[PDB]
Design an enzyme around this catalytic site. Structure first.
Site, short mmCIF file in Angstrom:
data_model
loop_
_atom_site.label_atom_id
_atom_site.label_comp_id
_atom_site.label_asym_id
_atom_site.label_seq_id
_atom_site.Cartn_x
_atom_site.Cartn_y
_atom_site.Cartn_z
N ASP B 29 0.79 -1.22 0.00
CA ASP B 29 0.00 0.00 0.00
C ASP B 29 0.83 1.28 0.00
OD1 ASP B 29 -2.55 1.66 0.22
OD2 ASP B 29 -1.69 2.04 2.23
N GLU B 262 -16.61 -30.84 7.19
CA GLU B 262 -16.64 -31.90 6.19
C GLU B 262 -15.22 -32.35 5.93
OE1 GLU B 262 -17.09 -31.17 2.04
OE2 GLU B 262 -18.65 -32.67 1.69
N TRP B 284 -24.98 -33.42 3.66
CA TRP B 284 -25.07 -34.82 3.30
C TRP B 284 -26.45 -35.48 3.47
CZ3 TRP B 284 -22.53 -37.85 0.25
CH2 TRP B 284 -21.27 -37.42 -0.19
N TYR B 310 -15.41 -41.01 -0.25
CA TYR B 310 -14.39 -40.01 0.03
C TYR B 310 -13.32 -40.37 1.06
CZ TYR B 310 -17.31 -36.73 -2.66
OH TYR B 310 -18.15 -36.12 -3.57
N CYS B 370 -17.63 -36.70 -6.50
CA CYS B 370 -17.50 -35.61 -7.47
C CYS B 370 -16.05 -35.19 -7.58
CB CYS B 370 -18.35 -34.42 -7.09
SG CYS B 370 -20.07 -34.90 -7.11
N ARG B 391 -15.17 -34.38 -11.46
CA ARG B 391 -15.83 -34.90 -12.62
C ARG B 391 -17.09 -34.16 -12.97
NH1 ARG B 391 -20.40 -37.47 -11.29
NH2 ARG B 391 -20.51 -38.14 -9.10
N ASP B 394 -21.43 -28.66 -9.73
CA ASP B 394 -22.50 -27.70 -9.57
C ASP B 394 -21.89 -26.34 -9.30
OD1 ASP B 394 -24.66 -26.11 -8.81
OD2 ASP B 394 -25.54 -27.76 -7.60
N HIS B 432 -21.52 -27.41 -14.63
CA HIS B 432 -22.91 -27.08 -14.91
C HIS B 432 -23.64 -26.27 -13.84
CE1 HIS B 432 -22.84 -30.75 -12.53
NE2 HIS B 432 -23.95 -30.26 -12.01
N1 LIG Z 1 -4.04 4.74 -0.06
C1 LIG Z 1 -3.43 5.40 0.91
N2 LIG Z 1 -2.64 4.70 1.75
C2 LIG Z 1 -1.99 5.30 2.76
N3 LIG Z 1 -1.21 4.63 3.62
C3 LIG Z 1 -2.13 6.67 2.93
N4 LIG Z 1 -1.47 7.28 3.95
C4 LIG Z 1 -1.59 8.61 4.13
C5 LIG Z 1 -0.93 9.33 5.18
N5 LIG Z 1 0.13 8.55 5.84
C6 LIG Z 1 1.38 8.44 5.35
C7 LIG Z 1 2.46 8.02 6.14
C8 LIG Z 1 3.74 7.91 5.58
C9 LIG Z 1 3.96 8.20 4.22
C10 LIG Z 1 5.21 8.08 3.57
O1 LIG Z 1 6.25 8.39 4.15
N6 LIG Z 1 5.15 7.54 2.31
C11 LIG Z 1 6.31 7.29 1.41
C12 LIG Z 1 6.31 5.80 0.96
C13 LIG Z 1 7.71 5.38 0.53
C14 LIG Z 1 7.47 4.16 -0.37
O2 LIG Z 1 7.36 3.03 0.14
O3 LIG Z 1 7.42 4.40 -1.59
C15 LIG Z 1 6.20 8.20 0.15
O4 LIG Z 1 5.07 8.34 -0.40
O5 LIG Z 1 7.27 8.70 -0.26
C16 LIG Z 1 2.87 8.61 3.45
C17 LIG Z 1 1.62 8.72 4.00
C18 LIG Z 1 -2.42 9.33 3.22
N7 LIG Z 1 -3.12 8.70 2.15
C19 LIG Z 1 -2.96 7.37 2.03
N8 LIG Z 1 -3.60 6.73 1.04
N1 LIG Z 2 -26.49 -30.75 -6.65
C1 LIG Z 2 -25.64 -30.95 -5.65
N2 LIG Z 2 -25.65 -32.10 -4.98
C2 LIG Z 2 -24.80 -32.32 -3.97
N3 LIG Z 2 -24.69 -33.40 -3.23
C3 LIG Z 2 -23.73 -33.19 -2.35
C4 LIG Z 2 -23.29 -34.01 -1.41
C5 LIG Z 2 -22.27 -33.63 -0.58
C6 LIG Z 2 -21.73 -32.39 -0.74
C7 LIG Z 2 -22.22 -31.56 -1.73
S1 LIG Z 2 -21.45 -30.05 -1.80
C8 LIG Z 2 -22.67 -29.07 -1.27
C9 LIG Z 2 -22.37 -27.83 -0.73
C10 LIG Z 2 -23.39 -27.01 -0.30
C11 LIG Z 2 -24.71 -27.42 -0.42
C12 LIG Z 2 -25.02 -28.65 -0.96
C13 LIG Z 2 -23.99 -29.48 -1.39
C14 LIG Z 2 -23.22 -31.96 -2.53
C15 LIG Z 2 -23.90 -31.41 -3.57
C16 LIG Z 2 -23.86 -30.23 -4.21
O1 LIG Z 2 -23.08 -29.33 -3.93
N4 LIG Z 2 -24.73 -29.98 -5.27
O1 LIG Z 3 -18.28 -31.79 -3.87
C1 LIG Z 3 -19.23 -31.92 -4.63
C2 LIG Z 3 -20.04 -33.03 -4.53
C3 LIG Z 3 -21.11 -33.15 -5.39
N1 LIG Z 3 -21.36 -32.18 -6.34
C4 LIG Z 3 -22.51 -32.32 -7.26
C5 LIG Z 3 -22.09 -32.19 -8.71
C6 LIG Z 3 -23.22 -32.89 -9.42
O2 LIG Z 3 -24.09 -31.91 -9.96
C7 LIG Z 3 -23.96 -33.59 -8.30
C8 LIG Z 3 -24.24 -35.05 -8.63
O3 LIG Z 3 -24.45 -35.21 -10.02
P1 LIG Z 3 -23.73 -36.38 -10.61
O4 LIG Z 3 -22.35 -36.00 -10.39
O5 LIG Z 3 -24.24 -37.48 -9.82
O6 LIG Z 3 -24.18 -36.35 -12.00
O7 LIG Z 3 -23.02 -33.63 -7.25
C9 LIG Z 3 -20.57 -31.11 -6.42
O8 LIG Z 3 -20.78 -30.24 -7.25
N2 LIG Z 3 -19.49 -30.96 -5.57
#
Ligand SMILES: Nc1nc(N)c2nc(CNc3ccc(C(=O)N[C@@H](CCC(=O)O)C(=O)O)cc3)cnc2n1
Ligand SMILES: Nc1nc2[nH]c3cccc(Sc4ccccc4)c3c2c(=O)[nH]1
Ligand SMILES: O=c1ccn([C@H]2C[C@H](O)[C@@H](COP(=O)(O)O)O2)c(=O)[nH]1
Ligand SMILES: NC(=O)C1=CN([C@@H]2O[C@H](COP(=O)(O)OP(=O)(O)OC[C@H]3O[C@@H](n4cnc5c(N)ncnc54)[C@H](OP(=O)(O)O)[C@@H]3O)[C@@H](O)[C@H]2O)C=CC1
Ligand SMILES: NC(=O)C1=CN([C@@H]2O[C@H](COP(=O)(O)OP(=O)(O)OC[C@H]3O[C@@H](n4cnc5c(N)ncnc54)[C@H](OP(=O)(O)O)[C@@H]3O)[C@@H](O)[C@H]2O)C=CC1
Ligand SMILES: Nc1nc(N)c2nc(CNc3ccc(C(=O)N[C@@H](CCC(=O)O)C(=O)O)cc3)cnc2n1
Ligand SMILES: Nc1nc2[nH]c3cccc(Sc4ccccc4)c3c2c(=O)[nH]1
Ligand SMILES: O=c1ccn([C@H]2C[C@H](O)[C@@H](COP(=O)(O)O)O2)c(=O)[nH]1
Lengths: 489, 491
Positions: B29, B262, B284, B310, B370, B391, B394, B432
């Site tokens: 930054d 999980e 599950w 698994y 999967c 394979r 979702d 898909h």
């Molecule tokens: N987005 C963002 N991020 C910040 N931190 C920010 N800070 C301030 C005020 N605070 C400061 C404190 C110290 C310096 C300083 O000595 N800087 C050198 C860096 C040398 C280098 O590494 O190039 C320079 O620029 O030469 C500058 C600002 C104001 N707006 C800001 N905006």
């Molecule tokens: N269509 C669909 N079927 C799923 N069967 C699962 C069985 C165990 C984990 C998962 S992962 C999962 C993560 C959040 C919600 C549901 C399943 C699935 C799963 C999935 O994600 N999508």
């Molecule tokens: O970790 C997982 C486990 C299961 N599925 C989903 C994918 C498929 O849409 C669904 C089962 O479909 P088939 O794979 O059975 O076709 O399981 C995931 O997406 N991530």
């Protein structure tokens, strides 16, 4: 006056035959051809090219036409055809386009073409007319101005013909949000073929993955002692509706893919059956010394234990040796997946696992690709995800992409579905330290179109067990060279 | 003449106490404050603010300092300050920043403030000076021109304090390729988007929110097991950082007590869902009724027995199930022990995995798991990451809960293995939204996220093993979610 060439050509630069096109109809190429040439614009075609076109299309609607003959009702040659465009038409005539051979070679030798819009047809077809050889020709096959590709599309297909599109070139509203982005933001990053801005080819996923692991990976030790550079949680996805992702930046061992997969499907655990057909990919991991390093002196040479395919067909069955019959034992995960695909495609429990903790210690290697899941949508399209725990990006990954894509075709077919996508989920994703220089070479190669894989004898094949090694053609595969990469054992 | 305010505040708009800051030192930054105020610019403060600042830092370097006071050696009010800036200074004075309370309230009444730069401190601290109430306030807590958020960062922390940065606002070769792109876009209604006004969406919760937009707009409607009917996609990815804060989602309140109970139930290897139910976690219960157990052909199960699922598979993979009352100590594989064991001894091993998917025991379970696999990874700085494969998801109900559950496990594991938690990576199969959740989810998408909380493990000293944690050993700090949104579970 910059000029642009628009062509479709086979890998041998073939463009036509019998004053016509060599290949059956390429629908998408035509869409592409139409769009590009209008945005009015000028198209310029050779005598005979005008004839090739059917009459209802012959005047190319919404574009200035030009023919370059010396015998018809229109200019005497290309240089004189450019004059006509400068003289009149200077108002309205945006960019121009040349669209047959001799008119292409004319434009190349006179060096007026800044860009080439090339449809790379992946198949060879009988042809008697060819596009001129040129620098940048490498973009077609493995065969100072030069043409560098700047765009390379995804692989399309029509009527069994795979094809790419490339383009080659001659070589305070919210600005008061900026100071905050500035301080939130940050040696030599490698990039795959950096000159290509528009990277449609799905093989860039694999090439960019390689780059990411080398630029941003963390150097680590491993079981093999070779050392890796790794990342964790990586993703690729490959479309299967037009073409097949058999990688083009290096030749993938296709026969091995197809044999190992058929070997998985039978539930075979004898690596010697692979080795005796010249597929040795398992051999180093089933030697006496390595089975002993795995605390399994009782294992015959070759026996991979209760691994991959054993688990697919007989999950949780007690393992004995590779000669024993397990028919009826364990859960047949593959048949269940198919049955559910046929009877209830919306079920969400269509999975097959190779990971059985009860049996990991008995296996030569713990499986790498350990889970796949299938999904059908509402158009009968099938997709597959495979989860791989440990991925040798150099060697294994390309093979694995092919392997599981092929299984998707096989399953799509016995279930009466169309294959759609392969989704690749990767855990530990690593590049061996001793593969790095080789992989840097690979990243200087521009991918070529993906082939298509067909299934032959579809009428005969009803169940997954029915496929044999002789039931697939790979069509239009035009890879770059093999690159040798040693296996870390 | 546009002005910008720069502040840091608590959720109740608190900014000061005893002419000092309410919270311990926030390094980022201070970086933020310095970088925003110099780019020369002027800062304008009230007398008491001038006095807050230590003297070595006092005239703020490289900035024109103006103090408003009636006692010092400097202008008598804000209107008077802005006159100063116009009469002299019109050259090289670029932007002007207001940096105390009451200087902030004068600047809002005058209406001259174009952007607010608000650092959102997520904890409450004793405060005696407050930032004025302003329309848009809702970015802070569950408490006509309005100030609308346009930028919302990721969560940071220092010294046990989680915080956000938000910004509010008042209300050759290209050419050639263009045509080839033009037709590859064309083929192929009213897109739903989560808080579209927010242009820089760093908050990692935008991953969850954009996943809900994507399924709604691009997912395909299907039937399913339940009869309810869903929209779905296939193959989805999220990742959540764990080094600075904990991804307990903020756009609706998540059931922390359920997450935590999980997860502990899982670790024990418990299959009795009544133990969850009895502590007020009923997640599950619908899936273990007598009725649901029979529709699964398991009439011999006592109500609440989830079967060998698994936690049973985690702690006793492959052991022969009997009922939820039996002792299984020593039976089957304890995957969780093994993973921990491997993390303590061999952090570069690539077999650090645990699965609940056991096809031999799937019929005996009330529900197939999967979330069925997780794998662990340690890098070269002793940072643990975790991937879980689910394979079926979702997105409305389970996903947020599932995110928190495995994120918490990551913390629990990192602690007993002496590692720092880094990242939780979510891999999703069938992904898909139920059709009866859609209206509610669209409401949820109108709510901008709040900074994530931190989760501290209390009593670290006493906790040496994974089984040692209890429900009382965690505190959630700075959790300021939006209201609950009631969504029924498709059975
Ligand atoms: N987005 C963002 N991020 C910040 N931190 C920010 N800070 C301030 C005020 N605070 C400061 C404190 C110290 C310096 C300083 O000595 N800087 C050198 C860096 C040398 C280098 O590494 O190039 C320079 O620029 O030469 C500058 C600002 C104001 N707006 C800001 N905006
Ligand atoms: N269509 C669909 N079927 C799923 N069967 C699962 C069985 C165990 C984990 C998962 S992962 C999962 C993560 C959040 C919600 C549901 C399943 C699935 C799963 C999935 O994600 N999508
Ligand atoms: O970790 C997982 C486990 C299961 N599925 C989903 C994918 C498929 O849409 C669904 C089962 O479909 P088939 O794979 O059975 O076709 O399981 C995931 O997406 N991530
Ligand atoms: N797929 C593709 O990208 C394309 C394929 N094609 C195919 O290619 C074949 C047509 O090409 P191609 O056979 O090479 O014939 P062209 O269409 O190039 O026509 C050749 C004729 O054009 C004139 N011409 C060409 N170059 C010159 C020159 N340099 N100076 C003077 N006149 C010139 C001559 O006419 P004249 O005899 O009057 O002197 C020559 O006989 C067909 O099979 C067609 O289908 C065609 C376009 C695109
Ligand atoms: N975290 C954050 O974002 C920031 C927090 N703070 C904190 O807030 C507190 C300082 O704020 P606060 O207490 O409101 O005091 P202020 O800094 O606003 O100063 C109050 C004094 O400045 C003068 N003043 C303020 N407003 C007017 C006005 N409208 N017209 C004329 N004179 C005015 C008066 O001085 P006189 O008596 O001379 O007339 C008044 O007594 C401290 O605790 C400080 O650390 C400060 C900046 C930023
Ligand atoms: N990259 C590429 N691909 C090619 N095929 C190609 N073919 C040729 C020459 N062969 C032609 C064959 C058919 C037509 C025809 O009737 N076309 C309609 C189609 C409209 C539509 O279908 O949208 C049109 O143009 O609107 C025109 C020319 C030259 N360059 C080419 N370059
Ligand atoms: N280091 C390493 N070890 C491997 N063991 C295998 C066994 C079967 C298939 C594979 S895949 C594969 C096989 C041969 C060539 C490239 C990848 C591997 C494999 C691999 O790729 N890398
Ligand atoms: O299909 C496969 C099979 C195996 N491996 C490789 C990846 C690992 O580098 C190697 C060793 O496995 P671990 O035991 O290190 O996981 O197996 C693959 O890349 N692809």
């Amino acid at each position: 006056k910059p000029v642009c060439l628009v062509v479709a050509m086979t890998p041998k630069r073939g463009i036509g035959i019998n004053n016509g096109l060599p290949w059956p109809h390429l629908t998408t190429d035509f869409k592409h051809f139409s769009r590009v040439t209008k945005t009015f614009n000028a198209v310029v075609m050779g005598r005979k090219t005008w004839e090739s076109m059917p009459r209802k299309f012959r005047p190319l609607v919404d574009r200035l036409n030009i023919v370059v003959s010396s015998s018809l009702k229109v200019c005497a040659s290309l240089p004189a055809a450019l004059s006509l465009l400068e003289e009149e038409y200077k108002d309205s005539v945006d960019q121009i386009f040349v669209v047959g051979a001799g008119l292409y070679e004319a434009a190349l030798s006179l060096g007026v073409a800044s860009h080439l819009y090339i449809t790379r047809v992946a198949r060879e077809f009988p042809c008697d007319v060819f596009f001129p050889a040129f620098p940048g020709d490498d973009i077609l096959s493995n065969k100072e101005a030069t043409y560098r590709p700047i765009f390379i599309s995804k692989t399309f297909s029509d009527n069994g013909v795979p094809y790419d599109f490339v383009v080659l070139e001659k070589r305070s509203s919210a600005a008061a949000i900026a100071p905050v982005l500035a301080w939130m933001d940050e040696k030599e990053l490698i990039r795959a073929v950096p000159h290509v801005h528009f990277r449609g080819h799905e093989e860039f996923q694999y090439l960019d993955l390689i780059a990411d692991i080398i630029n941003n990976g963390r150097t680590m030790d491993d079981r093999t002692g070779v050392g890796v550079i790794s990342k964790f949680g990586c993703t690729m996805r490959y479309s299967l509706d037009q073409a097949f992702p058999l990688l083009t930046t290096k030749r993938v061992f296709w026969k091995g893919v197809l044999e190992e997969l058929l070997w998985f499907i039978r539930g075979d655990t004898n690596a010697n059956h692979l080795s005796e057909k010249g597929v040795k990919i398992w051999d180093k991991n089933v030697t006496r010394e390595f089975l002993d390093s795995r605390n399994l002196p009782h294992r015959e040479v070759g026996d991979i234990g209760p691994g991959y395919g054993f688990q697919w067909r007989h999950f949780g069955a007690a393992y004995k040796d590779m000669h024993t019959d397990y028919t009826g034992q364990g859960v047949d995960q593959l048949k269940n997946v198919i049955q559910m695909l046929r009877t209830n495609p919306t079920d969400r429990r269509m999975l097959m696992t190779a990971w059985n903790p009860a049996a990991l210690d008995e296996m030569a290697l713990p499986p790498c690709h350990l889970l796949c899941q299938f999904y059908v949508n509402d158009q009968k399209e099938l997709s597959c995800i495979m989860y791989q725990r440990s991925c040798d990006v150099g060697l294994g990954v390309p093979f694995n992409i092919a392997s599981y894509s092929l299984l998707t075709l096989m399953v799509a077919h016995v279930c009466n579905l169309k294959p759609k996508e392969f989704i690749h989920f990767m855990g530990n994703t690593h590049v061996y330290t001793n593969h790095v220089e080789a992989l840097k070479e690979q990243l200087r190669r521009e991918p070529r179109p993906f082939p298509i894989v067909n299934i032959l004898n579809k009428e005969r094949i009803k169940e997954i067990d029915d496929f044999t090694a002789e039931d697939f053609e790979v069509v239009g595969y035009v890879p770059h060279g093999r690159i040798q990469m040693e296996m870390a054992v």
